[PDB]
Amino acid sequence: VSSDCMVCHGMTGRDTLYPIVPRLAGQHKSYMEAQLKAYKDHSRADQNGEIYMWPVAQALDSAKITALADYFNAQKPPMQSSGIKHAGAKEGKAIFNQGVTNEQIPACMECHGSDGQGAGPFPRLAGQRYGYIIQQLTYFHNGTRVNTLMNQIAKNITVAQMKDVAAYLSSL
């Protein structure tokens, strides 16, 4: 019953309910799967996750998690820019692809791929919602969304740069 999801995550013709609800279309299976399991075992405990995903995840078994992961991964069209213009695309592009050395900000593409397509456990960011990206970078920077990799990666990202990388990524 994907309509246990689509109310919020939207549907082929409707975006997600709010900027903080990430698009799922085309997200990699292993990633989707990891998140759903994290929500289920509460390992991903950032605020929005606790509030809007622990509940629904609690009613998911290994089989459904995988079924769902598969479903959204195949969804078409994969998560795309809504068309809403976000300032900083250029800035964010340089950050995503080149990172910022003196600020010790890693080049995002090394893990998220040449253009935010991601791969397996490394999530696609291309086409993700602007607010959602900023929100997750905030959670990673905050430490409220626990992930050794991203907690370390987000350590030096400022709110301003989060917006740039978000603008860029959500425009893809």
Stretch of residues binding Zn ion (CB under 5 A), selected from 3-11, 34-42, 93-101, 129-137: 129-137
* Residue 148: Cβ-neighbour burial (10 angstroms; 0-12, 13-18, 19+): exposed
Tell me which of 130, 139, 140, 168 binds Zn ion, using CB under 5 A: 130
User: Side chain identity at 51, as an amino acid letter?
Assistant: I
Question: With CB cut-offs between 5 and 8 Å by kind, which of Zn ion, ligand HEM, none does residue 167 bind?
Answer: none
Question: Could you tell me how many residues of this chain bind ligand HEM (CB under 6 A)?
Answer: 43
Residues sharing a CB contact under 8 Å with residue 76, sequence separation 6 or more, in sequence order: 12, 25, 26
- Report the distance separating Cα 36 and Cα 129, nearest Å: 19
127 binds ligand HEM, rule: CB under 6 A: no
Question: With CB cut-offs between 5 and 8 Å by kind, which of ligand HEM, Zn ion, none does residue 126 bind?
Answer: none
The answer on whether 28 is annotated among ligand-binding residues is: no
**DSSP H/E element including 139:** helix 130-142
Residues 20-49 that bind ligand HEM (CB under 6 A): 20-22, 24, 27, 32, 34-36, 46, 48-49
163 binds Zn ion, rule: CB under 5 A: no
Question: With CB cut-offs between 5 and 8 Å by kind, which of ligand HEM, Zn ion, none does residue 29 bind?
Answer: Zn ion
- Report the distance separating Cα 117 and Cα 31, nearest Å: 12
Are 131 and 20 a contacting pair, CB within 8 Å? yes
- Report the distance separating Cα 99 and Cα 153, nearest Å: 10
Question: With CB cut-offs between 5 and 8 Å by kind, which of Zn ion, ligand HEM, none does residue 82 bind?
Answer: Zn ion
Cβ 32 to Zn ion, closest distance in Å?
9
Residues of this chain that interact with Zn ion (CB under 5 A) are: 28-29, 82, 84, 129-130
